[PDB]
């Protein structure tokens, strides 16, 4: 049982590694793109106000 649990902990490193890469991709690509989306929406609100 301890040996089986050791393998589970050892294999768990893969999920943590891909999670870090997934989070890194979101910060580098998704977040800046969403900022551009919000800016365009902000301008549209002013035009609708006009």
């Amino acid at each position: 049982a301890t040996k089986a649990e050791y393998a589970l902990t050892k294999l768990k490193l893969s999920n943590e590694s891909v999670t870090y890469c997934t989070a890194q991709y979101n910060l580098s690509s998704m977040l800046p793109q969403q900022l551009l989306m919000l800016k365009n929406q902000t301008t549209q609100v002013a035009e609708q106000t006009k």
Binding site: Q44, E47, Q48, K50
Partner: protein
Amino acid sequence: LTTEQINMTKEQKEAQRAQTSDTRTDGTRVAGSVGKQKELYDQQITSYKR
């Protein structure tokens, strides 16, 4: 597209202002289709009197 609708709203306002008023928002006399239509009435009014 919202910016383009600004001009259409202004122009449709002038069509509404053609009634109950002989001058546009800027103050110039209306001379378009409605202006020509009014002139026809003036000739017809004189024609009936004549």
